[PDB]
Amino acid sequence: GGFRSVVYFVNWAIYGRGHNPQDLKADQFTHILYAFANIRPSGEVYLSDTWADTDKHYPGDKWDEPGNNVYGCIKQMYLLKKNNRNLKTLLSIGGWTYSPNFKTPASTEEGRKKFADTSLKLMKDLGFDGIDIDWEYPEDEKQANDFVLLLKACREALDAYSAKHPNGKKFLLTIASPAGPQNYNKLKLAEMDKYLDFWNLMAYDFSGSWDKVSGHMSNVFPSTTKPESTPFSSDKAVKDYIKAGVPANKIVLGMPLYGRAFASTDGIGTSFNGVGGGSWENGVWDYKDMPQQGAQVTELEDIAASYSYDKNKRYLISYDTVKIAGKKAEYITKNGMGGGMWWESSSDKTGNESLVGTVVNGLGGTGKLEQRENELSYPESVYDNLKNGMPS
């Protein structure tokens, strides 16, 4: 099958970022993953923002109208799917912020059963092609086994629904995973793999506020010359998953569409104090705001890493340029990996400067993307417009 092109659409982008599902270059992707869904102690998966998610009326939504109906970004993603039939959508559950509350439901059968059922309920009501868990991170051995069992719960859940609808489609189950060794070495990766459609390796956040020296935050290869500039590397993670037994073609390489900043720095590998501002939070800048005035951009192709640095303000921002995104595409093809994943859809540029554009083209263009037709039929949906495949 060809490569996957996965992006995350984040619940909250419809606010300050102004990004709605309508303005996704859908022909560029195969999988939109909508983040994030939260979990209750019970195991109950629920929607983080029913305004964004389900209720907001976009242009095109009759306010009035017969039926019990869904709107929000869920209707918009379904409309994206009706128009782009190779575009699948997955509900993504967890996130850095909600992962404190995965361990308690995951430890019991009731909790996992409840997780599986509520997740399926949500998928089949809202028109999703599957679900994606993002538990950062199972912190002990027990939590890891729990994660295999939870995965199993969800795989069994989704499959039962497909059994109930044999003329319809099979459904997806993925996870966002750790590129840091201290986290993935706790995971039972190969047992987990049995349940998953693919893995979205978060091959980023390798350097940031937490560190003492400015580093590369999503570099592919270790700097031999300057070890302190590369505390992690994509490559270590990918070949470690592969020695662990994950098929490479199931590993989708995560790439950031934002950059992490460092203040009071001479440059890469030196100490910094502070991280400055950001586009939305401190120390984090949207790639489409790069490059900032007065910074020179350095591209280190051999380890596939780049950064801007302003010599006067002594500020470093680790982020990928098109040349670097191209080197990343290169690694994906060369190593026969599952494709590219991006966090997150609003921070990218367009046209010739789209990082995603750049990767799809180095993948051989859209013609080399995995052709898997999505699911438009949701017979059991609790929403009438969605159940009826959204007419006008």
Ligand SMILES: CC(=O)N[C@H]1[C@H](O[C@H]2[C@@H](O)[C@@H](NC(C)=O)[C@H](O[C@H]3[C@H](O)[C@H]4N=C(N(C)C)O[C@H]4[C@@H]3CO)O[C@@H]2CO)O[C@H](CO)[C@@H](O)[C@H]1O
């Ligand atoms: C609390 C909440 O749900 N939303 C917050 C929001 O928190 C976000 C951001 O800080 C994200 N960081 C960004 C946009 O750079 C952060 O993203 C994480 C994400 O959880 C990790 N998991 C993935 N996946 C691929 C699933 O990618 C990584 C990235 C790495 O950056 O996620 C949190 C929620 O976990 O912060 C905003 C302000 O930015 C706030 O309004 C509120 O909506």
